[PDB]
Symmetry: none
Subunit: 230 residues, 2 copies
């Protein structure tokens, strides 16, 4: 595999891997190890179907447990990154394993695993209900909701304010009901973590929203909302 | 604060407050309560920057739900009036709270925050698109458009005609793209209102245009254009 200009970073490569059919066929290891849990399978070159991943969407999602782990998105030293589909209602995670082989990003394996669960409310299952039921959503928002945005008088200036429930309904971004994406840049993904940070990032535009959730005894709740759009 | 001749009405005071720096410095309560929604702060004398408000503009705007509420502009019994900036594309508001303390108008507080309930939010989002996209604007004008002026020979009559889209483009006033003003004289500004009346008033001249919008199932549309200039 000859390294291209897209390989300089995972984020550049992944958009081209998903949007360019000819490039995708060169960057998939064949026979491709496919794991259906503990059941090992292999997908041969002839039966590969073009995977668009999240490239045709208006936005994609990223998940973190801690704010400082968002620093990892810009790490260009990464030689292994995974792309994930989290099937919210199916309790399944589909994961694509990418590796930079001699500066050239390759798909090495795909696996399917169940979402990990514990004694506390599961973030994934809570999120599915939060994203689709407005009444449940209204009961799972801290009041007032912390809102961080741009000062309308100066864009180089931060504005910290609050939103009431009616203002949240007017400002809230579109929320995925069926699937979440995630890119593993090495950020902690612990199912016992009491915080969950969902970044919503625009594809081919400056859209950027960050939703901070905290797990209370009563369950998960949205407590901080950032609009870092450019 | 010693009451002056301009304090007879809010409209006379506000032009003076914005155009005379020395007058402004004595009419602002210090430390000035400054809010960012439910977040509370203060602004001391040393960090106060002269605020021109809308005094340097050729015109300013007012918003109503019902025509008869425009009678409230001339209400001299008012002892508390608010001025606000509506940042159209950012859905942000800068509200200035004025109070007549012993016949002397004073700035009591400022709130820089996201737009709230009963602040014409739905109409304001539509208005930003109407004011900046000529194609969208042309699709959101009732055809034919009612065009009314006051009759200079008789106050009980009006001169009434209709305009086509080419005639509207030739007669239409300048429309603000980024920011609207509003002055709260006590007029209803309900979110469920199916009419929104935008008054464009001249600063230091008799210019007065009134744009009547109605919310159809298909959205807001301009249906009546009034020239009440004097």
């Amino acid at each position: 595999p000859k390294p291209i200009e897209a390989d300089e970073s995972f984020d550049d490569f992944i958009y081209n891997f998903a949007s360019d059919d000819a490039l995708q066929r060169q960057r998939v290891v064949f026979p491709l190890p496919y794991y259906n849990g503990e059941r090992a399978s292999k997908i041969d070159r002839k039966y590969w179907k073009h995977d668009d991943l999240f490239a045709k969407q208006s936005y994609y999602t990223l998940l973190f447990d801690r704010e400082e782990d968002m620093d990892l998105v810009g790490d260009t030293s990464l030689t292994s990154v995974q792309v994930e589909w989290i099937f919210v209602k199916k309790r399944m995670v589909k994961k694509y394993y990418f590796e930079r082989i001699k500066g050239a990003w390759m798909l090495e394996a795909i696996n399917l695993r169940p979402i990990e669960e514990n004694e506390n409310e599961d973030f994934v299952e809570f999120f599915g209900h939060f994203a689709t039921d407005s009444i449940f959503q209204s009961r799972r928002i801290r009041q007032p909701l912390v809102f961080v945005t741009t000062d309308p008088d100066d864009d180089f200036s931060i504005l910290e304010t609050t939103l009431d429930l009616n203002q949240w309904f007017a400002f809230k971004p579109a929320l995925p009901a069926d699937k979440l994406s995630n890119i593993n840049y090495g950020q902690q993904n612990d199912d016992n973590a009491s915080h969950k940070i969902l970044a919503l990032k625009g594809i081919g535009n400056g859209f950027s929203n960050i939703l901070y959730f905290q797990r209370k005894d009563s369950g998960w709740e949205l407590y901080k909302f950032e609009d870092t759009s450019i």
